[PDB]
A paper describes a structure:
We therefore pursued a site-specific 'disulphide enzyme-substrate cross-linking' strategy, which enabled us to obtain four structures of JMJD5(Q275C).Mn.NOG.RPS6(A138C), JMJD5(N308C).Mn.NOG.RCCD1, JMJD5(N308C).Mn. OG.RCCD1 and JMJD5(W414C).Mn.NOG.RCCD1 as cross-linked complexes (Complexes 2–5, respectively). In these structures, clear electron density was observed for the substrate backbones that enabled modelling of residues other than the target arginine (RPS6 aa 137–138 and RCCD1 aa 139–142). Compared to Complex 1, single sidechain conformations for the target arginine residues corresponding to 'productive' (A in Complex 1) and 'non-productive' (B in Complex 1) orientations were observed in Complexes 3/4 and 2/5, respectively. In the substrate complexes, the β3–β4 loop folds to enclose the target arginine region and active site. While all of our 'productive' complexes (1/A, 3 and 4) are consistent with those reported for other JmjC-hydroxylases in terms of the relationship between the active site metal and the oxidised C–H bond, neither the 'productive' nor the 'non-productive' complex structures appear to be consistent with stereoselectively favoured efficient metal-based backbone hydrolysis reactions.
Author numbering: 182 to 416
The structure:
């Protein structure tokens, strides 16, 4: 079924119905007036960030054998992986861009809902996810709560509860134990038969929308367009 969408719910309703039980939701009317929503174009990103060095993941999925991580300027990333007919999938993923480029922090806000946590605001981690259509983040789980805010473009997102972990066949290794062995959109059901019947939620996340990913909820994300998302990891 589809992740529910709520317009600016109260703090208490979010706490009781979503945060405490660990249920996903999309929040509307919250980030739709970030200055980023109107300001961030490729040209703006080049002007403010183009000369800075960023880590880039190259390859279809980080679970692939040919996948690698490199460094280049934001201008180079845009030129090679976005505008010119790219040879490979590149993704400026999981990067603390706002600590590197404080000017861009002026264009975003931490959602007020994160104050319902038991952690310090100073310890919230903010990451950029910027890439072309077709980037894929394989199914995995994270150790904090997350607000994933969509700024540019759309993402297809699949969510599996931590109760379903058995049917997701986590990797055995220590580096990949938070990651499923299954390719969500083309699962090998001969090797991973339990996956087929496992229930899930899905959504297309559009600009101005916030997805709440409860701590340890398994998530899979594919960009449908040129995309820019901002995540907030909080407790
Ligand atoms: O946006 C993506 O491709 C993947 N995002 C995340 O895994 C996250 O925000 O924790
Ligand atoms: Mn994640």
């Amino acid at each position: 079924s589809t992740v529910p969408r709520l317009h600016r719910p109260s703090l208490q309703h979010f706490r009781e119905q979503f945060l405490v039980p660990g249920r996903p939701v999309i929040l509307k009317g919250v980030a739709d007036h970030w200055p980023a929503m109107q300001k961030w174009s490729l040209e703006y990103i080049q002007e403010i960030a183009g000369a800075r060095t960023v880590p880039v993941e190259v390859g279809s999925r980080y679970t692939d054998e040919e996948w690698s991580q490199t460094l280049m300027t934001v201008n180079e990333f845009i030129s090679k992986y976005i505008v010119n007919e790219p040879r490979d999938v590149g993704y400026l993923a999981q990067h603390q861009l706002f600590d590197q480029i404080p000017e861009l922090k002026q264009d975003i806000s931490i959602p007020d809902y994160a104050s319902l946590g038991d952690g310090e605001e100073e310890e919230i981690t903010i990451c950029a996810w910027f890439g072309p259509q077709g980037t894929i983040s394989p199914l995995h789980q994270d150790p904090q709560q997350n607000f994933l805010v969509q700024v540019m473009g759309r993402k297809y997102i699949r969510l599996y509860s931590p109760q379903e972990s058995g049917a997701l066949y986590p990797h055995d290794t220590h580096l990949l134990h938070n990651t499923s062995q299954v390719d969500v959109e083309n699962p090998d059901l001969e090797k991973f038969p339990k996956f087929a019947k496992a229930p899930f939620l899905s959504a297309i996340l559009s600009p101005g929308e916030i997805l709440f990913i409860p701590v340890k909820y398994w998530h899979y994300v594919r960009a449908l367009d040129l995309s820019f998302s901002v995540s907030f990891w909080w407790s």
